[PDB]
Design a protein around this ligand. Structure first.
Ligand SMILES: *[C@@H]1O[C@H](CO)[C@@H](O)[C@H](O)[C@H]1NC(C)=O
Ligand SMILES: *[C@@H]1O[C@H](CO)[C@@H](O)[C@H](O)[C@H]1NC(C)=O
Lengths: 24, 96, 48, 20
């Protein structure tokens, strides 16, 4: 069925929170 | 309710928040779909009002410890008072 | 501070919900347990 | 001292040291 690998696509903002220059 | 910003510390509820902080004008860049921002330790520092793109900072109301200076009982009875770590334009508005 | 946010065994973490949003007496019971937890956190910090 | 001073990059209160 022509499988494919998804490299780094599939990420979304989990919350409407604003965070600046941090790792969470 | 009308909005009073920086007049004095004022407890509040914008949409679903505990509040209890003084409000000030902010200039932080802020995305459209976002609503509020937490600086560090999940503490909410800035919020956005629905009536404008105007964002507001939050600062806790000042507190500190009062200390007493004294030259000793037998020498004299004057003292001096030091309110620690606080801008003092609110000294007459100190409850304790 | 992280320890401040946790609930230590209760319906909610922040005090005001337990206070106003339940009856006073058993709200007092939930308050009692949450107090014991926060006191323990202060204990370990000072000793370290 | 200038080099040493630059290399080191860093209900709660923090009191100030007594000697500046
Ligand atoms: C007052 O007390 C201080 C120490 O507490 C002492 O040095 C001083 O001599 C006393 N004053 C008099 C007049 O004795
Ligand atoms: C303290 O508060 C007064 C309010 O008039 C303000 O003018 C001053 O800039 C504040 N900070 C300082 C530096 O004292």
């Amino acid at each position: 069925p022509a499988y494919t690998n998804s490299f780094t696509r599939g990420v979304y903002y989990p919350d409407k929170v604003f965070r600046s220059s941090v790792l969470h | 309710s009308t909005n009073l910003v920086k007049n004095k510390c004022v407890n509040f509820n914008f949409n679903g928040l505990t509040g209890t902080g003084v409000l000030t004008e902010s200039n932080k860049k802020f995305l459209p779909f976002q609503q509020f921002g937490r600086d560090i330790a999940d503490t909410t520092d800035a919020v956005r009002d629905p009536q404008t793109l105007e964002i507001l900072d939050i600062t806790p109301c000042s507190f500190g410890g009062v200390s007493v200076i004294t030259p000793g009982t037998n020498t004299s009875n004057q003292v001096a008072v030091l309110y620690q770590d606080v801008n003092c334009t609110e000294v007459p508005v100190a409850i304790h | 501070v992280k320890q401040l946010s946790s609930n230590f065994g209760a319906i909610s973490s922040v005090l005001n919900d337990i206070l106003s949003r339940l009856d006073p007496p058993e709200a007092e019971v939930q308050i009692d347990r949450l107090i014991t937890g926060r006191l323990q956190s202060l204990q370990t910090y000072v000793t370290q | 001292e200038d080099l040493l001073f630059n290399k080191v990059t860093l209900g709660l209160t923090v009191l100030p040291p007594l000697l500046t």
